[PDB]
Design a protein around this ligand. Sequence first.
Ligand SMILES: [Mg+2]
Ligand SMILES: [Zn+2]
Ligand SMILES: [Zn+2]
Lengths: 52, 67, 98, 55, 170
Amino acid sequence: TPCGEGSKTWDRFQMRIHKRLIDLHSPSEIVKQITSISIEPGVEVEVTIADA
Amino acid sequence: YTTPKKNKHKRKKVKLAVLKYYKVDENGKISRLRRECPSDECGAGVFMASHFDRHYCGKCCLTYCFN
Amino acid sequence: MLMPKKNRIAIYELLFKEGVMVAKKDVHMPKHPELADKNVPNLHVMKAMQSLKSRGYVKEQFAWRHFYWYLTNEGIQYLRDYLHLPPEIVPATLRRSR
Amino acid sequence: GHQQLYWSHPRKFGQGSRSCRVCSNRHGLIRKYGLNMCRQCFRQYAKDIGFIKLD
Amino acid sequence: AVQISKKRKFVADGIFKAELNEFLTRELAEDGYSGVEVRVTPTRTEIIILATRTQNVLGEKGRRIRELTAVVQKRFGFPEGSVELYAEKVATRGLCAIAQAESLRYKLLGGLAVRRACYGVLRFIMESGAKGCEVVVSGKLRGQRAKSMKFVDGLMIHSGDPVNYYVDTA
RNA sequence: UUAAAGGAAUUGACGGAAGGGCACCACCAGGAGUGGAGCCUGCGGCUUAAUUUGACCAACACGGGAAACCUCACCCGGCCCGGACACGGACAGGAUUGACAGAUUGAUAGCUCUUUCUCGAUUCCGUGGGUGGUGGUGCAUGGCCGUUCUUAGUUGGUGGAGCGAUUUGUCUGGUUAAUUCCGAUAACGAACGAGACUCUGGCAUGCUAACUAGUUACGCGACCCCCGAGCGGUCGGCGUCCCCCAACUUCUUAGAGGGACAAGUGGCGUUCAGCCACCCGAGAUUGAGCAAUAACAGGUCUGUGAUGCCCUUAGAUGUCCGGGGCUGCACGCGCGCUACACUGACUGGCUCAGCGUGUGCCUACCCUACGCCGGCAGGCGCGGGUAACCCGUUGAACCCCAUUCGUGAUGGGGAUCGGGGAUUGCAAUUAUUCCCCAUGAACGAGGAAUUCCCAGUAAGUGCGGGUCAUAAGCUUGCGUUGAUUAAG
Ligand SMILES: [Mg+2]
Ligand SMILES: [Zn+2]
Ligand SMILES: [Zn+2]
C-alpha cells in the first residue's frame, strides 16, 4: 500500500533466472562466430577466457 | 511572527572613495605605500594589507606576526 | 548566481560543442563528472542552465531525477557570439553523423 | 554557504544518505540488489524491471 | 571497473529499461511512443522506438535521434558511440493501447469534448480489428464531484493468467 | 397555516416475516490461548519549550516508522540564497564577492563590529515576476489500496409481457465449491465472474545431460583384525578430463514429456446430472496467485516535478548547522516474548535439515575460512568468494542417553538494579549493542468476555531474509518435532 492503511496484504514478486553451461577446446578467433549469430535480446551469454 | 530582538542586517562594505597608493616625487618617483604580498604568485602584483601592528595578505592568506 | 567568468566558459564550451549535458538534481554534490577538470560544482550547472532556459535559449525536461538539455534555435547563434566564435564553429546538432 | 560547516554532517550510514533512485523518498526504501527504489514505486515499475507477479 | 555479480547484472539492465521508458514517455508523448525494445551487443548497441509518427521523432538529417542518443550515452556511461536508436512505425496504430492514449491525450488537450473523444478512439480500435476494448475516463468532469465514465465495448477477459498477454493496459 | 398530503404498481434495502442453502473472519466437539504477572511495542490522556503528524470488523508491532544526531515536519537558536527572467537608477573620479586579527557566538559562522586587503561586471537596490514547500484541502482530484466482496453473482442484442418505471432471459425441482450442471420452459442465442489457466507440492530405478553435482567400481595411503591372513571393517583420506592414466545416473541439479480423468467394480436417484464407499494407484479435495458489474463522500496531497485551488514567499512554512523532543508517567486500552517447573531445570555427552543473502559508476563501509593473542565480549595478520565454484555436507534448536536437584517462592522465574569490561560510530549521556560478577520482584494456570484452526494442520522449536554502522521480543519465508477433536 502506498499509505499505511489497509488490511495487511503482501505480494511476492519473485524473479527466477536459469543458467546452462558448455565447454570448448576450440581456437578463439571462431569464438567471434559463436557470438554474432543471433541478435536475440533474451539471452545473456558470456565468453570465458581462452588463455587455458 | 514578531521577532522583537532584531536580527542583524546585510554586510555593507568599505565604500571609502580614496585609493591613492603611489606617491609621486622629484618629477616622477614611485612609492610602495604598503608592503607587497610576498606570495609565490603575486610578487608586486597586489598589496599586502596593513593593520595597525600586523600584516596579512588578503588573498594568499599567509600572515606577518604580531609585531 | 555567482557566474565566475572563466568557469561559465567552462560550462558553455561543452554545452555548445555538443547540445547535451546530464546534471542530476542533487545540489550538495561536490563535482560534475562530465567536465571533471575545471573544478566546477553541480549547483551552477542548474543555475546557469536556469539562465539558459529563462532567456529562451535552451529547453529541458525532467527525468526520473536527472536533467537533460536541448538547445533552441535562438540559443545556438547567441552562444558563438557570446564566446567570440565565427559562423563556422558549429554545434553538434547540425550534422555530425554520415 | 561558507564551506567549513555547510554540509558538515556525516551523510553516511543511516537513512540521511540512502535516497530513492526515482525521486528521493527517504521513508522506507529497498536497499536490496541495488534497486534503491521507494516501495510505493515498486508497483509502478514491477513489470518493467523483471519483477513479474506471483508465478 | 571490475565486474559485478549476476543478480545485480539483471537489475542493472532491468533498471536501464525502466529509465529510458520514463524519459521517452516524457520525450515522445506527442508522437505516439508505445514502448522501446533493447538489444545488447558488445559493439555499437541497438535500441528501437515504436513510434506512430516517424516524422517528428526524426529531425532534419536525424537530429532528434543524435541528441536522443547522446543523453543515453552520457548518462549511464556507455562509451564513445556504442549505442543507436531507431524510429519504427508500429503496426496497427490502433491496437497498442499506449499509443492512442497518448494520441487521445491530445484529443482531450486539443479541446474536444470527452464524449466525442472517447467514442472516436473507441470506434477506431474497433475498426482496427479488435475483439473487445474499453476506456475509462475518470476525474473532474462538468460539475464539482468527480464521477467517472466508462465505455466498455465488446467482450473482454479479466482474470487468470491470460490477462497478461491478450490485453495491454495503459 | 402549507407544497404537498393522498392512490396504485416497480426496483432495491430491511424485518426480533416464513421456506431453502453456505462459512471455523460462525457455532457445536475439542485443543493453542490473549484478558491475570513481568516485560518490549502501539494508541489515548496528563505534563511539557515541543512531547509534530495520519488512521478510532476495514484504527491501535500501522504509516514496509526497531528515531541517539541525520532522516524531521515539532520546539529552542545560528547561517545561506540555491528569489530564474523583464523594467529603471546606482556601475568606471570608487557597483559586487571573499578574509586573518580580535571584546563577536553555541561555534574556526568575517553573523555583527573595529581595523583593512582581495574578487572582477558576475551583481546589488527599486518594481513586476517564476520559485521551493514532509505548507493546508484525500469533501476539488489522478494513480494505487482497502472493503460489503471470496460469498456466487452481473449484462446487452433480439423477440414476448406491460400506458410506464421494469420484468421474463437469470426457472418449480434434482444436484453442485459455485446461475455448476441436468432437465423445466415465451423465450432463444451470448459475454464476462466461477472454472479453465500460471506457479507450487507429490511418483517418474522411463528420456536427454553433467571438472562448479554425485554414486558405484578400482589403485594407493592409514588403522583395526579371534591371528596373522585380505575381495575383512573404517575414511568427506588421496587419485581415475588434464589431455583419457573408469564407467554410470539411484540419490543433486533441472529440461521436455508421461501421470488421474471421478476411469473400474458395486448400492443409490427419473438408471438424468450426480452422490456413497470400495479395487488399482505416488496421489481419488496440494496450497496460494490473479479475480465481475456497480460503488463507499474508506485511506493516502508525508513516496512522486501525479495535482487543482488557496497560503507562504529573504525578519521565509525554502534550506543548512548544533542542541531538545519524537523514549517524558497518579491511569486505561491493543498486538507480542518469557514464564508460572518434576512431561521440569541444570551439567556433560550424542546429535539430523531446508529457505537465502554477500564487496558499490554514485556510497567510501560485504560473506567469512584459518592462524595467533583474550576465562567472555573481542582484538591483529593471513586467505577464499561477484558465488551449485568461498563461508558450507550450514554439525540450529527441540530432542536423546548420562549425572545433579526434589514440590521449598527453590538450582523455577529473571524483572529490577550496582560496578567493571569491549565492539559500533562524528556523538552512547536519557542506559545502541554484546559480555561478566552481584542483586532475585510479582508470578502458585487465571473473573465477565473473546480470538485462531481442523491435516504435516494447531502447536512446542529454532534458522534465514527485510529495517542494518550498531541493531529483532516485529514481520516475512524456511525446515524439524508433531497432535486429541470433526465430515456436522
Ligand atoms: Mg507524494
Ligand atoms: Zn599570490
Ligand atoms: Zn497553517
